[PDB]
Amino acid sequence: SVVKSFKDLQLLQGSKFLQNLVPHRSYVSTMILEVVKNSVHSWDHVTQGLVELGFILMDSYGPKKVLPSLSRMPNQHACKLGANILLETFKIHEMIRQEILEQVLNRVVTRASSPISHFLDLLSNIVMYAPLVLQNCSSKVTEAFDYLSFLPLQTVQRLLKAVQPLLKVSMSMRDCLILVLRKAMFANQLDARKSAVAGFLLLLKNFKVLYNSVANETFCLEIMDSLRRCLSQQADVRLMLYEGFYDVLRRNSQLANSVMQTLLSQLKQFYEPEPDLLPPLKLEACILTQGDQISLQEPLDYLLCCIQHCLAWYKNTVIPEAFYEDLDDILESITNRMIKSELEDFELDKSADFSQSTSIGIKNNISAFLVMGVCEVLIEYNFSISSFSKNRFEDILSLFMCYKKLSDILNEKAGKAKTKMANKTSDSLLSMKFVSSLLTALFRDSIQSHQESLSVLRSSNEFMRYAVNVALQKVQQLKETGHVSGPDGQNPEKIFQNLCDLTRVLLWRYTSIPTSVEESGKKEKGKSISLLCLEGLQKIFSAVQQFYQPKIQQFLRALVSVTQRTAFQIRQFQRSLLNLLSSQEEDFNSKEALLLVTVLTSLSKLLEPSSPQFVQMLSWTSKICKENSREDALFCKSLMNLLFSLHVSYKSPVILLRDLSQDIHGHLGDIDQDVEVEKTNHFAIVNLRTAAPTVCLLVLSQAEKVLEEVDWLITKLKGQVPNQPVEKAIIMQLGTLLTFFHELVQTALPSGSCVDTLLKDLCKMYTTLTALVRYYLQVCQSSGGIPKNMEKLVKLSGSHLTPLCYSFISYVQNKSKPAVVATAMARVLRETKPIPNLIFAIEQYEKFLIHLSKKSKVSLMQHMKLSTSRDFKIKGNILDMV
Amino acid sequence: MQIFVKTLTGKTITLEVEPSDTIENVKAKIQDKEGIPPDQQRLIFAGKQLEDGRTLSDYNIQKESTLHLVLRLRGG
Amino acid sequence: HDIITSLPEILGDSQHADVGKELSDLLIENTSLTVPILDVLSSLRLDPNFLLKVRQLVMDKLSSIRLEDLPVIIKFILHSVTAMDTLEVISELREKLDLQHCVSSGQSCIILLFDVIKSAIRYEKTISEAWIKAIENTASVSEHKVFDLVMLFIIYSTNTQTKKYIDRVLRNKIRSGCIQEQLLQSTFSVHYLVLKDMCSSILSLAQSLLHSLDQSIISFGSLLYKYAFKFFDTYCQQEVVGALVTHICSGNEAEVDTALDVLLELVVLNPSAMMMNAVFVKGILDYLDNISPQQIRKLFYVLSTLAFSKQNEASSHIQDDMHLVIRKQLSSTVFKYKLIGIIGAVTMAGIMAADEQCTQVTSLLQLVHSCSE
Amino acid sequence: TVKKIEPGTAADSQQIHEEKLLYWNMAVRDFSILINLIKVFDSHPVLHVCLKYGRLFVEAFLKQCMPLLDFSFRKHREDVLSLLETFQLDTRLLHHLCGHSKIHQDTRLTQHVPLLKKTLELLVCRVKAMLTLNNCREAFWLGNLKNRDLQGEEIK
DNA sequence: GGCACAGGTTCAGAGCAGGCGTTCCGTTC
DNA sequence: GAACGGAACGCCTGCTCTGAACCTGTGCC
């Protein structure tokens, strides 16, 4: 009943036609939370059933499909109702909250074969509400620690966040945990090492700011010595430390003098501190080769990244003394000796050809990524040091030239084999904050003191289309996973601030500079900087609405309600698409137009569906579809989808389906080979090229959505037995799309997916009519009826649709215009189905018409003709073949 | 203090009990004033079956509260 | 031996596989030093090819191993399985394992081996699922052994997401003429100490099997309860009786019939065990309005044969209480209560009639004749 | 009887294929002789019997003849064509029977029309699939069927 | 003339709905 | 009034929905 409630609510909110007819009844979700709210009066026979319902809902409908809309959206919503029922039961009934918490912990531990993300969200909510109650389950928690080497890293990393209010209180459990983690570092299973580093970094993080402080400053200095084990271990266990130390320093300041030392000695195994030896880093010690097994260990790029970030933090917030004044000279020597290294110092490009079969090619491919990362960190560092000094920007440009040299060397070596090397598309080591503050300074700095040094970077266009691409990579990385790579990379307020400050500059570069100002040619027309700023705008607009959904007020303030700001942001892309369409025909920009449509699509979802700005938006889109030719098919598909997504939230889109069917009929031809039709006046984006595989499938898909809404209405009406407006609406919808189906049945469609989707939607049409008739059976037996609406609809289905279906079937079968035998047999036994399924659906319509005609004393079968049937023959073509 | 006890035949009986007294004391009072045996008695308050070992203070029974008495005849 | 057993916490990552080779140099040198070297190679970091080699060197000599070595060996075998070598090593393991030639240290080391197997199947689905799928692929030969019952109970208890698949495999295995009484008797007579952990899982399987048709299945559902009451502790006995009263008071006609047959078999087998839990059997007298008169006859028979054993005349409380409830049932004007009173009176007089007992049956028959006049 | 007949393989001898095709031809001529008795015995139960068991015969013809026709077509083409033009002669009678059950609006008859109709259309499309897998797909013609009664007229 | 991206296709899996099997009440001569 | 046809509750088959990966076709270099 709860999942059917959620499918009701989603399908009811999806359309305006359904909201005009139905007045909203209470849903089963708000009933069950009312029950939990009303259980405070404390009849506690219920509460055990509420806990058992909550665990049933979280168990059955957890993300395991997600390791769509039909299987997705009413199965997140049932799982969130489960966790919401359990949390509300927990926050009311003080007796229960040892059997809820044990049952959650039983599912976090024994599982983690299956996803348990919903349970680790429930555990965090339970604990953060009342952290004292975990002292009731001190037995069960301490027997989860004994298994915190077999759980994966995600479980451990979040369970140990939850637990630690125990460990501030307790002392025996704390000294149990450290013992578990220290014995876990010496495991053989891979997850145990990274679980141990996650536990160590959390204990360093939140176990004092600086109990007694003298009992902390030594205790972290114990753990820190244990962490000098992990830096000796393999690459992933190192990399978790290099990414964690910045947060450790932020939340625990006084460990700084230790932590930097832990890094600095780690640097000294790979840095050769003698000048005039040209490769300043030891990359031949960062590769572990034994038994023809070649592995990266000690990712030096992330080490330099971590040293740079902690150094900048120490300079910024600590100072307002020997380790950092050394490290400045270390990084400066690394910079100055990295600039004048010409790839013969790392044995690259001529002694190596980067072949990923030989060990030497794999080693060179690893060291290539190493030197690229090192150059990226040094670009960020040289930008960091000076207030815009012209020497260090030339240094930045030379480092980028080395980076781009290695990048296009790997591009040349990736041009022979398949493009499976996604390790070249490995994330840049620029922090999101730096790429924000770099693009801002690149595109929006007019201060004359800075301008001479910035003109070194603005002159080189490759640097610009690197430093835009990197921000595109960052926002794409926020789309895929909910957090980005760098420092403050999981802290959503900082990600929101950097997305606002990326949007502000990308809009400026797209707006203030058009695409027609180019001097670049086709190679750079594929990747023009205006187009990349528009693409980043499309990814930002998309990725705000997933995550920063409450803040779409404040996100628009960065650039009066949501509708006015969204409309003003819409109008710029609207004018830009008009300027791109109306102006040129010759070789018009397909990509820019297509993702302008994508930007407008993402932006139109923020308008209120009854607003005047929504109405002018729908009117503009309809006028664009009514005017422009635009022979490119994907752009047409994107425009029509934008039009339908706008239209279905305003009113039922059956008249638009009818008009598009009439244009398809006019364009594609006719079955009989002599019927003269042309009705192009309706919609202009329909061609001989366009309409056949592209507008046909799209209009059929929208027909299916209309038929789904009508079938849901009929099924709801069959529940009750208020009525007459619902039946009049159903009959008007069905008559309109019956005319729609008529025009497509007569049409001379191609022999691909268009004919098959038509046949399947005709079965869906007839099934919907069969369900209407079978509903009228229930009513008309009681009183006497079939009013003139239903009789007229039956007459229309008999005259216009059905005999044309028969002639269309004969057209499909008569039309006849290298094969692996098993797949060929599978193909033909697939293709033998949809004509019989249409024949069955017609005959089962007529049979329920017979039933109705008998027990209503009105002969509805006098409208329809006698069923046409078909016989095959075989001709004398078999003598030619054999 | 005073409470009401309503049984299945609609008979309402007034009981003079203190919240410190246990539930079998209330069943003994029903045995004295109505003759119904305490093993057959079953007491319901606010949709909760009263246990024997508790008192009125465990179930938050205040002044003029209404109990429901049903007769649990094992076989008949 | 102490130097060997301490090697995982000493050595760093740069020196594993070297000591990987040289420990195997000591492995062929002595057969007295097989097991600490095997535990160390189970706990160190090794490449899978060498691990495959040493796994073959273990697996060829599996029959020449006394039970004391068998946990630390089999752990090593269940943490050397690859993603591709699952079914082969599981089938070879289930073939080669005897558990009979080894059989006070034996039972304890058997419990250690089953602890090891529970730890191996807990967190790696690739061994549990392949073990279940390697049992139904030996449905052909009727000669599978005690191990495949205990292992199905273990995987049914431990892993929750494979419960339905184990249930379906057990139904389609028992309908094939496979696992029957002669396996279950040997299982619950030998492996009673290992299964004594999983009382609740065994009774859940019995409850799930009693609900169906196909009297061969319901036979197994009865015999599971029977053997669980036979071998386990007093707490599991109490839980068995609770489950049986749950089947009687709730379930349908086949369920009530089967559970009453089981209670009759357990009171005729062990009255002294049922006398501790006789209040739970007394608890069926609340639900006489839900039970068919034939099952009323059977219920009164099992209760009244429980009450009238000679050594349990110190526990006369049930004997006076059911006399009370019979005289209460008979004293009703309603025919539906008088029917149950008459049935209980006659069956009670019959069981208690195998000089004062003659006067007792005299009084009982005279009172039922007086009220039934 | 006819559901128990199994189609062979191409590895099987041509003698077993020939005897199976003779066996099928016997069943089709018996089915035609059985169906043709409709016209002289028109009632509720005789029409009910042929409506149910007609589709149950055609489904057996679909599942356990058409693989044999797919196998043995390049060798025994004339037998296959003779079999199909024989099966058409009572398939037409079943179509007229479905029509007769619709026209006299008889509920107890009409409940078995849609699965029979679906099954005859499956038969047509399965013949097209046969010619597709035997590389004569452009020989499969079609054409409408005159609406006759049980005796044979043109009701219009 | 080859490589990369897109889109189709095909297979594998899983879950549930509808149709047939038993059992009883309505309807038609 | 009798007999034969319409009607409901449970279990099995298959069909469809969906995803994932492969592969093939087309366009640009």
Swiss-Prot record, chain B:
List of residues that carry (Microbial infection) ADP-ribosylthreonine: T66
Note the effect listed for R72A. Answer: Impairs ubiquitination by CRL2(KLHDC3) E3 ligase complex. Impairs ubiquitination by CRL2(KLHDC3) E3 ligase complex
Effect on the protein upon substituting R72G: No effect on ADP-ribosylation
Positions spanned in the full protein: 1 to 76 of 685
The residues forming the signal peptide are none
* Organism for this UniProt entry: Homo sapiens (Human)
Q: Function, please?
A: Exists either covalently attached to another protein, or free (unanchored). When covalently bound, it is conjugated to target proteins via an isopeptide bond either as a monomer (monoubiquitin), a polymer linked via different Lys residues of the ubiquitin (polyubiquitin chains) or a linear polymer linked via the initiator Met of the ubiquitin (linear polyubiquitin chains).
Q: What is the effect of changing I44D?
A: Impairs ubiquitination by CRL2(KLHDC3) E3 ligase complex. Impairs ubiquitination by CRL2(KLHDC3) E3 ligase complex
Q: Cross-link position, Glycyl lysine isopeptide (Gly-Lys) (interchain with K-? in acceptor proteins)? A: G76
Outcome of altering T66A? Abolishes CteC-catalyzed ADP-ribosylation
Q: Where is this site: Essential for function?
A: H68
Cite the effect that the entry attributes to T7D.
Impairs ubiquitination by CRL2(KLHDC3) E3 ligase complex
Where in or outside the cell it occurs: the entry states: Cytoplasm; Nucleus; Mitochondrion outer membrane
Taxonomy, superkingdom: Eukaryota
Q: Which residues carry this modification: ADP-ribosylglycine?
A: G76
How the protein is affected by changing K48R?
A: No effect on HLTF-mediated polyubiquitination of PCNA. Impairs ubiquitination by CRL2(KLHDC3) E3 ligase complex
The record places the site described as Interacts with activating enzyme at R54, R72
How does the protein associate with the membrane? Answer: Peripheral membrane protein
Tell me the organism's taxonomic lineage: Eukaryota, Metazoa, Chordata, Craniata, Vertebrata
Q: Where are the transmembrane segments?
A: none
Residue(s) carrying Phosphoserine: S65
Position(s), cross-link Glycyl lysine isopeptide (Lys-Gly) (interchain with G-Cter in ubiquitin): K6, K11, K27, K29, K33, K48, K63
Domain annotation Ubiquitin-like: ranges? 1-76
**UniProt modification remark:** Phosphorylated at Ser-65 by PINK1 during mitophagy. Phosphorylated ubiquitin specifically binds and activates parkin (PRKN), triggering mitophagy. Phosphorylation does not affect E1-mediated E2 charging of ubiquitin but affects discharging of E2 enzymes to form polyubiquitin chains. It also affects deubiquitination by deubiquitinase enzymes such as USP30. Mono-ADP-ribosylated at the C-terminus by PARP9, a component of the PPAR9-DTX3L complex. ADP-ribosylation requires processing by E1 and E2 enzymes and prevents ubiquitin conjugation to substrates such as histones.
What is the protein name stated in its UniProt record? Ubiquitin
Query: Quick one: effect of changing G76A?
Result: Loss of ADP-ribosylation. Impairs ubiquitination by CRL2(KLHDC3) E3 ligase complex. No effect on ubiquitination by CRL2(KLHDC10) E3 ligase complex
From Swiss-Prot, chain C:
Q: What is this protein called?
A: Fanconi anemia group D2 protein
Q: Which disease is it linked to?
A: Fanconi anemia complementation group D2: A disorder affecting all bone marrow elements and resulting in anemia, leukopenia and thrombopenia. It is associated with cardiac, renal and limb malformations, dermal pigmentary changes, and a predisposition to the development of malignancies. At the cellular level it is associated with hypersensitivity to DNA-damaging agents, chromosomal instability (increased chromosome breakage) and defective DNA repair.
Copy the domain comment.
The C-terminal 24 residues of isoform 2 are required for its function.
List residues traversing the bilayer. none
Please tell me in which tissues this protein is expressed: Highly expressed in germinal center cells of the spleen, tonsil, and reactive lymph nodes, and in the proliferating basal layer of squamous epithelium of tonsil, esophagus, oropharynx, larynx and cervix. Expressed in cytotrophoblastic cells of the placenta and exocrine cells of the pancreas (at protein level). Highly expressed in testis, where expression is restricted to maturing spermatocytes.
- What is the protein's species of origin? Homo sapiens (Human)
Q: Where in the cell is it found?
A: Nucleus
Say what the protein does: Required for maintenance of chromosomal stability. Promotes accurate and efficient pairing of homologs during meiosis. Involved in the repair of DNA double-strand breaks, both by homologous recombination and single-strand annealing. The FANCI-FANCD2 complex binds and scans double-stranded DNA (dsDNA) for DNA damage; this complex stalls at DNA junctions between double-stranded DNA and single-stranded DNA. May participate in S phase and G2 phase checkpoint activation upon DNA damage.
Name of the encoding gene: FANCD2
Q: How does it assemble?
A: Homodimer; cannot be ubiquitinated and does not bind DNA. Part of a FANCI-FANCD2 heterodimeric complex that binds and scans dsDNA for DNA damage. Interacts directly with FANCE and FANCI. Interacts with USP1 and MEN1. The ubiquitinated form specifically interacts with BRCA1 and BLM. Both the nonubiquitinated and the monoubiquitinated forms interact with BRCA2; this interaction is mediated by phosphorylated FANCG and the complex also includes XCCR3. The ubiquitinated form specifically interacts with MTMR15/FAN1 (via UBZ-type zinc finger), leading to recruit MTMR15/FAN1 to sites of DNA damage.
